């Protein structure tokens, strides 16, 4: 009688699907993996970079079945995209684990589609936690593992021995485009927060404390007479920000969030970066070697805007986001001499509906384009006037 | 272990091995006869994918799709018809057509097996027996280490090593060898199969003297 | 309206249209079978001009001149001989050989017609019945939009779509197709004629699965 991962995998494997994609920007073809998050609705999480600029998206289960899927949401900053299987029949979803309970040394299993071979399983351990720096503009709080990960594994599952999702495989460190024992996955907690938003609104409503800062290193801790050699150093706090109102002052060092210690400023940024606006949280602070606790509430941010090419697959030069709560899709900013402004679009406009269907958020709008009508008729409102924009 | 998938000629976590069952079947043959006597059901086919299963009103998204069955083949005799889908072999489910091909491809001729079939959404079972195949032939360079242009295989059961086909302007035909010949012995030692023949060459004699038979005549071919 | 005579690609007062009678005959066929089943009298001929009428001691300066009649053709059976001149069809006078060809060319096989003939300055009448022809075949590119090198037509009456001839090194033969094959069905739908077949392709399935029959065997050809 031998130890084996097989019993655990029999239940878990159907939960991991593989994504095939065709797109354009000049035609291309790509492939990766995805994880079923809601069996009934057919929701499937995956990497944003796998499904970015995709005209066609098809999903293949472990048992051979093929489905077509449509984009639901996407977040370039965290590299997480949510798609939806069309006509979801008899699916199996994965249960998610609490990634905050992960320790280095814990065992891991990776499941995905390397080089299109098909559903492939590999094993390792958690090598490190809170890794970041791959792209300093992205929100990254990676789990690192030595379970083999290669091209095609992206969007695939990283699970513990109990077949619970702890992460989504996103990247590797490889000088040769081949795995050398260093892989990175997005923690499952971040996935829980980002996807649950996309499901309802079509995008993520980003919150902010309103503080500038940098990594607290040992040298900086000497200059500042601080004991801790790690944490978020508050460079400054913006006026009229939640942080200011809360009582946070510059020269402060943030050591914990909601009880959980903080690896770094980068990690902290990644935590709050995924939480919805109006979230009640609490911070551990260190000022003058004295421990402080504070109650905060996330607020509106300037990072909400997303490009129009992301929604019309080829219409560049217009950023736009949800408005208030279910009040339509307001256009944030418009660039001159671009495909968007060529049909009339101007910043300040608020899309009320399209083709006689009401539009409250980006999801409802995307739901009309999924229909793929020959002509698109937007009912926007400029100032006190209602107008229409026709496409094609 | 046979191969790896490596863009850099270095391992990246993807290795492939031949299943031990296939090794058990192939080697046990080589031990007795010096080569594998390949069997065939006599059916053309392809991988059953989900798209093909839609066209064919089939439920299964995987298995071997019977394109056609050859006349006078074991499959035909057994009652297999085109448009059939093979789902199991000897009870064991079937991953793919490729796998199926690999299973029977290693079994010896005259093996009694049984297939699970799906035709018109109805489960069928069939009793088959492997038969002679055209894939038996092997090159002469494989046995003389440098004599190309003559394929040859065992004959019947321990009746010598018959030559299947001969190519013109090749090292083999330069010593006389012609297709149809049946090697009875070499250097006064009797030859029943390729193993016994290989056993004479292992001796590594300066001159090799083959006692072949063309038609009703017995002749000899000398080498070196 | 089909064409114009224009040196400049612009109308100059000369336009041409296909007569409505020809349209009635051709379309009524396509509706039922997907193509036209061409009939033939089986006679070679040419335009009867005034010069030819002098040579032949004929009075008429226009009509179809019978160069020769094919053996075992409806014309032969009917009593038509070379050196004959056809002046009418079903009562209607004949403008030319070209016109005559165009009339019968649109009529379905097995049509009962009658011809006015002039032989040795004597008026004759004959009862004919159109017969099978060699012009029935059509290209496979016409039905698969891009599959060249295989001609094919209906077979008998609603017996499927037989392939007339196949060319080597062409997209059609690359999937297996060989002349002599008879398409019984496609994707589990029965196929009696080219219309029913075209009706399956109108569905535009990802994979096309043809149930053809070569000799006494039934097989399948997969596409895409």
Structure, described:
This is part of a larger assembly, with three copies of chain A. With 392 residues, the first copy, chain A, is mainly beta. Chain A has four domains: 12-94, Trypsin-like serine proteases (Thrombin, subunit H, Beta Barrel), CATH 2.40.10.10; 95-206, Beta Barrel (Thrombin, subunit H); 207-300, PDZ domain (Pdz3 Domain); 301-392, Pdz3 Domain, CATH 2.30.42.10. Chain A has eight helices and 25 strands. Chain A has helices at 6-12, 48-51, 188-201, 218-223, 242-246, 265-272, 309-312, 362-369, and strands at residues 16-24, 27-38, 43-47, 54-60, 66-75, 80-85, 107-112, 120-131, 142-145, 157-159, 165-172, 183-187, 211-215, 232-237, 253-257, 260-261, 280-287, 290-297, 306-307, 318-322, 329-334, 350-354, 357-358, 376-382, 385-391. In chain A, strands 19, 20, 21, 22, 23, 24 and 25 form a seven-stranded antiparallel sheet that branches. The first copy, chain A, has a six-stranded antiparallel beta barrel with strand order 1-2-3-6-5-4. Chain A has a six-stranded antiparallel β-barrel with strand order 7-8-9-12-11-10. The longest helix of chain A has 14 residues, at 188-201. Chains B and C meet through helix 2 and strand 4 of B and strand 14 and strand 15 of C. Chain A: Substrate binds at residues 22, 49, 79, 152-154, 170-174, 209-213. Chain A: One of its GO terms (cellular component) is outer membrane-bounded periplasmic space.
């Amino acid at each position: 009688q031998m130890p084996s991962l097989a019993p655990m995998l029999e239940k878990v494997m159907p939960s991991v699907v593989s994504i095939n994609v065709e797109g354009s920007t000049q035609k291309f073809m790509a492939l990766g993996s995805g994880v079923i998050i809601d069996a009934d609705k057919g929701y499937v999480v995956t990497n944003n970079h796998v499904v970015d600029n995709a005209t066609v998206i098809k999903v293949q289960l472990s048992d051979g079945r093929k489905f077509d899927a449509k984009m639901v949401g996407k977040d370039p900053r965290s590299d997480i995209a949510l798609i939806q299987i069309q006509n979801p029949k008899n699916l199996t979803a994965i249960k998610m684990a609490d990634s905050d309970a992960l320790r280095v040394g814990d065992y891991t299993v990776a499941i995905g589609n390397p080089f299109g071979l098909g559903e492939t399983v590999t094993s390792g351990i958690v090598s490190a936690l809170g890794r970041s720096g791959l792209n300093a503009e992205n929100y990254e709080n990676f789990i690192q593992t030595d379970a083999a990960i290669n091209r095609g594994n992206a969007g695939g599952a990283l699970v513990n021995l109990n077949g619970e999702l702890i992460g989504i495989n996103t990247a590797i460190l490889a000088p040769d485009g081949g795995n050398i024992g260093i892989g990175f996955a997005i923690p499952s907690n971040m996935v829980k927060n980002l996807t649950s938003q996309m499901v309802e609104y079509g995008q993520v409503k980003r919150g902010e404390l309103g503080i500038m800062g940098t990594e607290l290193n040992s040298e900086l801790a000497k200059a500042m007479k601080v004991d801790a050699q790690r944490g978020a150093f508050v460079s400054q706090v913006l006026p009229n920000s939640s942080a200011a109102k809360a009582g946070i002052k510059a020269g402060d060092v943030i050591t914990s969030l909601n009880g959980k210690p903080i690896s770094s400023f980068a990690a902290l940024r990644a935590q709050v970066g995924t939480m919805p606006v109006g979230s009640k949280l609490t911070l551990g602070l260190l000022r003058d070697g004295k421990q402080v606790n504070v109650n905060l509430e996330l607020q509106q941010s300037s990072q909400n805007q997303v490009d129009s090419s992301s929604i019309f697959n080829g219409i560049e030069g217009a950023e736009m986001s949800n408005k208030g709560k279910d009040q339509g899709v307001v256009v944030n900013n418009v660039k001159t001499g671009t495909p968007a402004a060529q049909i009339g679009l101007k910043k300040g406009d608020v899309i009320i509906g399209a083709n006689q269907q009401a539009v409250k958020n980006i999801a409802e709008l995307r739901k009309v384009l999924d229909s793929k009508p020959s002509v698109l008729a937007l009912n926007i409102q400029r100032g006190d006037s209602t107008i229409y924009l026709l496409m094609q």
